[PDB]
Amino acid sequence: KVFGRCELAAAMKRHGLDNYRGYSLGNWVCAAKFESNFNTQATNRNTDGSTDYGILQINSRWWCNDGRTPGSRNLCNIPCSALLSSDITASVNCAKKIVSDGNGMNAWVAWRNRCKGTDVQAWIRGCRL
């Protein structure tokens, strides 16, 4: 599924991401935009054996188990395929774990480079929340 901007914002708000650990909703929409272009089936297969899965491109080395990545920790305790659903619940719950386990939103390269220091409020502006 390829989400619309306001549709994703609404779903992320229902899952309680607005101000989660101090990060406004717009930050989460912006990160998903430049990580996956809002595509829930996005997959990026890397040369180190790992793969990035789903709308937030969560990496298989630490966070989910796909049975093919060395040194897997599966810290979100899910198969990576669960991150490729049209329902974003699994990706949101794992993302909450990623930010809270010390890292913050710096964990997402796309957020660090294309959202940090910008008017992230623009990504939810005009939407029905």
mmCIF file of N, CA and C in Angstrom, residues 30-87:
data_model
loop_
_atom_site.group_PDB
_atom_site.id
_atom_site.type_symbol
_atom_site.label_atom_id
_atom_site.label_comp_id
_atom_site.label_asym_id
_atom_site.label_seq_id
_atom_site.Cartn_x
_atom_site.Cartn_y
_atom_site.Cartn_z
ATOM 1 N N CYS A 30 7.379 12.793 8.000
ATOM 2 C CA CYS A 30 8.527 13.167 7.182
ATOM 3 C C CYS A 30 9.497 12.003 7.028
ATOM 4 N N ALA A 31 9.752 11.270 8.113
ATOM 5 C CA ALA A 31 10.683 10.148 8.047
ATOM 6 C C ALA A 31 10.177 9.073 7.092
ATOM 7 N N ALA A 32 8.890 8.728 7.194
ATOM 8 C CA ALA A 32 8.319 7.726 6.302
ATOM 9 C C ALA A 32 8.340 8.191 4.853
ATOM 10 N N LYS A 33 8.180 9.495 4.621
ATOM 11 C CA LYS A 33 8.188 10.016 3.258
ATOM 12 C C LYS A 33 9.515 9.728 2.570
ATOM 13 N N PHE A 34 10.624 10.065 3.223
ATOM 14 C CA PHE A 34 11.934 9.930 2.605
ATOM 15 C C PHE A 34 12.591 8.579 2.866
ATOM 16 N N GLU A 35 12.036 7.753 3.752
ATOM 17 C CA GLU A 35 12.530 6.384 3.880
ATOM 18 C C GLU A 35 11.916 5.476 2.819
ATOM 19 N N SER A 36 10.598 5.562 2.627
ATOM 20 C CA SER A 36 9.881 4.612 1.789
ATOM 21 C C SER A 36 8.945 5.259 0.782
ATOM 22 N N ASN A 37 8.847 6.585 0.755
ATOM 23 C CA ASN A 37 7.862 7.254 -0.085
ATOM 24 C C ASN A 37 6.461 6.724 0.215
ATOM 25 N N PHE A 38 6.204 6.450 1.495
ATOM 26 C CA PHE A 38 4.901 6.030 2.005
ATOM 27 C C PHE A 38 4.496 4.634 1.536
ATOM 28 N N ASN A 39 5.445 3.815 1.088
ATOM 29 C CA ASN A 39 5.147 2.503 0.525
ATOM 30 C C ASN A 39 5.358 1.427 1.587
ATOM 31 N N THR A 40 4.267 0.766 1.987
ATOM 32 C CA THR A 40 4.335 -0.238 3.042
ATOM 33 C C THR A 40 5.085 -1.494 2.615
ATOM 34 N N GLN A 41 5.260 -1.719 1.314
ATOM 35 C CA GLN A 41 5.948 -2.903 0.821
ATOM 36 C C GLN A 41 7.401 -2.628 0.461
ATOM 37 N N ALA A 42 7.893 -1.418 0.712
ATOM 38 C CA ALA A 42 9.267 -1.087 0.362
ATOM 39 C C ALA A 42 10.238 -2.044 1.041
ATOM 40 N N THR A 43 11.221 -2.511 0.277
ATOM 41 C CA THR A 43 12.299 -3.323 0.823
ATOM 42 C C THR A 43 13.608 -2.871 0.201
ATOM 43 N N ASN A 44 14.626 -2.692 1.037
ATOM 44 C CA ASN A 44 15.967 -2.355 0.576
ATOM 45 C C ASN A 44 16.911 -3.443 1.066
ATOM 46 N N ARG A 45 17.466 -4.203 0.130
ATOM 47 C CA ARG A 45 18.349 -5.317 0.446
ATOM 48 C C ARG A 45 19.794 -4.846 0.331
ATOM 49 N N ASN A 46 20.517 -4.887 1.449
ATOM 50 C CA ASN A 46 21.862 -4.337 1.523
ATOM 51 C C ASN A 46 22.919 -5.405 1.255
ATOM 52 N N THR A 47 24.146 -4.940 1.014
ATOM 53 C CA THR A 47 25.258 -5.834 0.716
ATOM 54 C C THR A 47 25.828 -6.509 1.955
ATOM 55 N N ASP A 48 25.450 -6.068 3.155
ATOM 56 C CA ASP A 48 25.941 -6.669 4.388
ATOM 57 C C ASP A 48 25.068 -7.824 4.866
ATOM 58 N N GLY A 49 24.144 -8.298 4.032
ATOM 59 C CA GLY A 49 23.262 -9.382 4.393
ATOM 60 C C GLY A 49 21.937 -8.953 4.985
ATOM 61 N N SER A 50 21.843 -7.729 5.493
ATOM 62 C CA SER A 50 20.618 -7.245 6.107
ATOM 63 C C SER A 50 19.686 -6.656 5.052
ATOM 64 N N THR A 51 18.443 -6.414 5.467
ATOM 65 C CA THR A 51 17.423 -5.825 4.614
ATOM 66 C C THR A 51 16.608 -4.834 5.433
ATOM 67 N N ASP A 52 16.222 -3.728 4.803
ATOM 68 C CA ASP A 52 15.350 -2.736 5.418
ATOM 69 C C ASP A 52 13.923 -2.980 4.945
ATOM 70 N N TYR A 53 12.982 -3.011 5.889
ATOM 71 C CA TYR A 53 11.625 -3.473 5.635
ATOM 72 C C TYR A 53 10.611 -2.385 5.954
ATOM 73 N N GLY A 54 9.708 -2.133 5.015
ATOM 74 C CA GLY A 54 8.478 -1.441 5.323
ATOM 75 C C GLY A 54 8.563 0.067 5.248
ATOM 76 N N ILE A 55 7.483 0.679 5.730
ATOM 77 C CA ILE A 55 7.279 2.107 5.535
ATOM 78 C C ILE A 55 8.332 2.921 6.279
ATOM 79 N N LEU A 56 8.901 2.376 7.356
ATOM 80 C CA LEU A 56 9.965 3.047 8.095
ATOM 81 C C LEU A 56 11.321 2.373 7.914
ATOM 82 N N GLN A 57 11.424 1.409 7.000
ATOM 83 C CA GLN A 57 12.701 0.818 6.598
ATOM 84 C C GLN A 57 13.498 0.335 7.809
ATOM 85 N N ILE A 58 12.875 -0.553 8.574
ATOM 86 C CA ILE A 58 13.481 -1.082 9.791
ATOM 87 C C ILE A 58 14.425 -2.222 9.425
ATOM 88 N N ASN A 59 15.645 -2.174 9.964
ATOM 89 C CA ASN A 59 16.715 -3.067 9.530
ATOM 90 C C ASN A 59 16.656 -4.413 10.247
ATOM 91 N N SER A 60 16.970 -5.474 9.505
ATOM 92 C CA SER A 60 16.822 -6.835 10.000
ATOM 93 C C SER A 60 17.969 -7.296 10.893
ATOM 94 N N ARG A 61 19.061 -6.533 11.004
ATOM 95 C CA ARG A 61 20.165 -6.985 11.847
ATOM 96 C C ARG A 61 19.797 -6.912 13.325
ATOM 97 N N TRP A 62 19.112 -5.847 13.737
ATOM 98 C CA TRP A 62 18.788 -5.635 15.141
ATOM 99 C C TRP A 62 17.327 -5.871 15.490
ATOM 100 N N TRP A 63 16.393 -5.567 14.595
ATOM 101 C CA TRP A 63 15.024 -5.312 15.020
ATOM 102 C C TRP A 63 14.024 -6.404 14.669
ATOM 103 N N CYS A 64 14.185 -7.098 13.547
ATOM 104 C CA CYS A 64 13.255 -8.159 13.183
ATOM 105 C C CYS A 64 14.037 -9.340 12.626
ATOM 106 N N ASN A 65 13.368 -10.488 12.565
ATOM 107 C CA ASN A 65 13.978 -11.742 12.136
ATOM 108 C C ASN A 65 13.463 -12.103 10.749
ATOM 109 N N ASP A 66 14.372 -12.188 9.775
ATOM 110 C CA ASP A 66 14.025 -12.717 8.459
ATOM 111 C C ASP A 66 14.763 -14.013 8.155
ATOM 112 N N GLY A 67 15.491 -14.563 9.125
ATOM 113 C CA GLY A 67 16.134 -15.851 8.964
ATOM 114 C C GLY A 67 17.320 -15.875 8.030
ATOM 115 N N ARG A 68 17.758 -14.719 7.526
ATOM 116 C CA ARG A 68 18.872 -14.663 6.591
ATOM 117 C C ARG A 68 19.928 -13.628 6.958
ATOM 118 N N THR A 69 19.780 -12.929 8.083
ATOM 119 C CA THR A 69 20.697 -11.859 8.448
ATOM 120 C C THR A 69 21.632 -12.313 9.559
ATOM 121 N N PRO A 70 22.948 -12.154 9.405
ATOM 122 C CA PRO A 70 23.862 -12.541 10.485
ATOM 123 C C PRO A 70 23.702 -11.656 11.712
ATOM 124 N N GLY A 71 23.977 -12.245 12.872
ATOM 125 C CA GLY A 71 23.948 -11.495 14.117
ATOM 126 C C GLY A 71 22.589 -10.940 14.470
ATOM 127 N N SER A 72 21.521 -11.627 14.075
ATOM 128 C CA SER A 72 20.171 -11.134 14.311
ATOM 129 C C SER A 72 19.873 -11.081 15.806
ATOM 130 N N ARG A 73 19.319 -9.952 16.257
ATOM 131 C CA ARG A 73 18.900 -9.790 17.642
ATOM 132 C C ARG A 73 17.390 -9.826 17.818
ATOM 133 N N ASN A 74 16.633 -9.506 16.772
ATOM 134 C CA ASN A 74 15.171 -9.521 16.788
ATOM 135 C C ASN A 74 14.621 -8.861 18.054
ATOM 136 N N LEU A 75 14.997 -7.596 18.242
ATOM 137 C CA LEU A 75 14.628 -6.876 19.455
ATOM 138 C C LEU A 75 13.162 -6.456 19.483
ATOM 139 N N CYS A 76 12.495 -6.379 18.333
ATOM 140 C CA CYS A 76 11.054 -6.163 18.308
ATOM 141 C C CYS A 76 10.271 -7.471 18.338
ATOM 142 N N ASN A 77 10.960 -8.611 18.289
ATOM 143 C CA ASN A 77 10.344 -9.927 18.456
ATOM 144 C C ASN A 77 9.235 -10.160 17.433
ATOM 145 N N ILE A 78 9.550 -9.910 16.167
ATOM 146 C CA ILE A 78 8.596 -10.152 15.087
ATOM 147 C C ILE A 78 9.329 -10.668 13.855
ATOM 148 N N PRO A 79 8.678 -11.452 12.996
ATOM 149 C CA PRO A 79 9.240 -11.682 11.663
ATOM 150 C C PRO A 79 9.193 -10.398 10.849
ATOM 151 N N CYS A 80 10.231 -10.184 10.040
ATOM 152 C CA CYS A 80 10.313 -8.954 9.260
ATOM 153 C C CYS A 80 9.133 -8.812 8.304
ATOM 154 N N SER A 81 8.555 -9.931 7.854
ATOM 155 C CA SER A 81 7.428 -9.868 6.927
ATOM 156 C C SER A 81 6.233 -9.148 7.539
ATOM 157 N N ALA A 82 6.109 -9.171 8.869
ATOM 158 C CA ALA A 82 5.044 -8.427 9.530
ATOM 159 C C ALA A 82 5.167 -6.927 9.296
ATOM 160 N N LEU A 83 6.363 -6.440 8.975
ATOM 161 C CA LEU A 83 6.561 -5.026 8.686
ATOM 162 C C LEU A 83 6.163 -4.652 7.263
ATOM 163 N N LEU A 84 5.719 -5.616 6.456
ATOM 164 C CA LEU A 84 5.338 -5.364 5.072
ATOM 165 C C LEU A 84 3.827 -5.405 4.873
ATOM 166 N N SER A 85 3.059 -5.269 5.948
ATOM 167 C CA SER A 85 1.610 -5.281 5.847
ATOM 168 C C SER A 85 1.080 -3.904 5.461
ATOM 169 N N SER A 86 -0.172 -3.885 4.998
ATOM 170 C CA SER A 86 -0.855 -2.621 4.756
ATOM 171 C C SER A 86 -1.239 -1.934 6.059
ATOM 172 N N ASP A 87 -1.330 -2.688 7.151
ATOM 173 C CA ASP A 87 -1.561 -2.140 8.482
ATOM 174 C C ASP A 87 -0.224 -1.777 9.115
#
